A paper describes a structure:
In this paper, we present a strategy to fuse specific, high-affinity protein binders to obtain multivalent or multispecific scaffolds of predetermined geometry. DARPins are used as building blocks to confer the desired specificity to the construct. A series of rigid connector modules replacing the [name] capping repeats allow to combine the individual [name] domains in such a way that their distance and angle can be altered to test different geometries, bringing the binding partners of the DARPins into a defined spatial arrangement. The two helices are not just joined end-to-end, but instead the two domains are made to overlap in such a way that the joining helix is stabilized by contacts with the domain cores along its entire length.
D12_H15_D12_H15_D12, the construct with the longest shared helices, crystallized in space group P21 and the structure was refined at 2.4 Å resolution. Similarly, in D12_H15_D12_H15_D12, the N-terminal [name] interacts with the C-terminal [name] of one symmetry-related molecule, the middle [name] with the C-terminal [name] of a second one, and the C-terminal [name] with the middle [name] of a third symmetry-related molecule. Considering the elongated shape of the DDD molecules, which amplifies the effect of small deviations in the connector, they agree remarkably well with the designs. The structures of these DDD fusions are very extended in one direction (>110 Å from N- to C-terminus), and thus amplify the effects of small deviations in the inter-domain angles, making the agreement with the designs even more remarkable.
Numbering used by the authors: 13 to 491
The structure:
């Protein structure tokens, strides 16, 4: 229509004819099927006059297209110095990025448009911005033999590394104004010192709520680990900065992060007596059963350090979880799949055991509830768990005669030659109880045919003794 005539006359260089369409009401910000606009094509083709005109007639300088390319991208790709200056003066997004993360500075650094690089930096371009492949403009200029550009961008970078050192000091001291100026002048909020402390670690350790929130506003990694696995939430919870604990959680902080010693935020809060932080972490899902390398839970540290209020609080949080484990054992025996998943979501231990050592996986394999077996293996249930007499779930599957469950357990590393205290292996129970299909599977998986219970009976002997000829034959041909 009236607009399609414009986008075409914009790439043709018909300066005088552009005035005709605009006077007759042709919209200035029309778009095609790929997203291009009269300003894109005038900047791509290098028609400065047509650009300037469209800017007096109000053209969206930062207009994006189907993949987020502004007119400045196109002027940077082609290398039109003048059009770059005219687009920036009208408020062009000097740091605009496409869907790949490519900014105008990347393009000028890759195609060797030195003058445009100077221009873009003059207007506050981000020299450190990485694209999809984690490559800065300097990286591109290096990989394309543009050494004069590589030199300039490298000078820029080392200055910005001084700002990074200052930002770390400003965040520890509490100079909120210094921090904000540093960020405004390109300092990296995710920089780290020698031991991996980022500015968020230091603001969190020292208790600077304002500086914590500013760092988070500018993309700081809330979960950054230092060289020993300590996150900002560890330091907040150690020093007892309740409000920083709250802000860190609200921004994605991991409530159960563990350092190299297995210490979690709830350990420090519990050992050092920060009741409100204990409540906040529990409210946010902290694991009360987590142990450090000394087998100590937060509860143990609490009583060990004479913090009785927190001690009782964690006892009740733990007693509540014992009842879910109890429910998981009965849910796993009865075959109620949906009930199993809910109890796991709410914190049921898939490796709890009753008085005689049966685990939810034992009961599920005994009763032939395959669906629950898969759920329990997919959530970390020990596949080679012994009860108080040495029976694994693979014992209970061969005895009962569940072919499917046997193949699953073996598919997940289940011990095939496990023996109870008597010497009975899964192959004895399969041959004993006439489950030929399970015998087959066991043989393929290295089942020992020479194993003997305390009575000196091989699986072959038990097939013979119990009148299972087909099985005795199979066990005969193997040896």
């Amino acid at each position: 229509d009236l607009g399609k005539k414009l986008l075409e006359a914009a790439r043709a260089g018909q300066d005088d004819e552009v005035r005709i369409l605009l006077a007759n009401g042709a919209d200035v910000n029309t778009a095609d099927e790929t997203g291009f606009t009269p300003l894109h094509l005038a900047a791509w083709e290098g028609h400065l006059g047509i650009v300037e005109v469209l800017l007096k007639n109000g053209a969206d300088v930062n207009a994006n297209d189907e993949r987020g390319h502004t007119p400045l991208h196109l002027a940077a790709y082609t290398g039109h110095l003048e059009i770059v200056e005219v687009l920036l003066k009208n408020g062009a997004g000097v740091n605009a990025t496409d869907v790949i993360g490519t900014a105008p500075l990347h393009l000028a650094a890759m195609w060797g448009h030195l003058e445009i690089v100077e221009v873009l930096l003059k207007n506050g371009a981000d020299v450190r911005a990485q694209d999809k492949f984690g490559k800065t403009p300097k990286d591109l200029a290096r990989d394309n033999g543009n050494e004069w550009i590589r030199e300039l961008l490298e000078k820029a970078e080392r200055k910005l590394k001084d700002l990074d050192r200052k930002l770390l000091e400003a965040a520890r001291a509490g100079h909120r104004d210094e921090v904000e100026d540093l960020i405004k002048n390109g300092a990296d909020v995710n920089t780290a010192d020698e031991t991996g402390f980022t500015p968020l670690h230091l603001a969190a350790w020292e208790g600077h709520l304002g500086i914590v929130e500013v760092l988070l506003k500018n993309g700081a990694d809330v979960n950054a680990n230092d060289e020993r696995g300590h996150t900002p939430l560890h330091l907040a919870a150690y020093t007892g900065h309740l409000e920083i604990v709250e802000v860190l959680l609200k921004n994605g902080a991991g409530v159960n992060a563990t350092d190299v010693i297995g210490t979690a935020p709830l350990h420090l809060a519990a050992m050092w007596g920060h009741l409100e932080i204990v409540e906040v972490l529990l409210k946010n899902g902290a694991d009360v059963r987590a142990q450090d390398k000394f087998g100590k839970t937060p509860k143990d540290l609490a009583r060990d350090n004479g913090n009785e209020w927190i001690r009782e609080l964690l006892e009740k949080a733990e007693r509540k979880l014992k009842d879910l484990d109890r429910k998981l054992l009965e849910a796993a025996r009865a075959g109620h799949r949906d009930e199993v998943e809910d109890l796991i979501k709410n914190g049921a231990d898939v490796n709890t055991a009753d008085e005689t050592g049966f685990t939810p996986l034992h009961l599920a394999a005994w009763e032939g509830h395959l669906g629950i077996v898969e759920v329990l293996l997919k959530n970390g249930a020990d596949v080679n768990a012994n009860d108080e007499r040495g029976h694994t779930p693979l014992h209970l599957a061969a005895y009962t005669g569940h072919l499917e469950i046997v193949e699953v357990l073996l598919k997940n590393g289940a011990g095939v030659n496990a023996t109870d205290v008597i010497g009975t292996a899964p192959l004895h129970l399969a041959a004993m109880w006439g489950h030929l299909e399970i015998v087959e599977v066991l043989l393929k998986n290295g089942a020992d045919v020479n194993a003997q219970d305390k009575f000196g009976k091989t699986p072959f002997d038990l097939a013979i003794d119990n009148g299972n000829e087909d099985i005795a034959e199979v066990l005969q041909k193997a040896a």
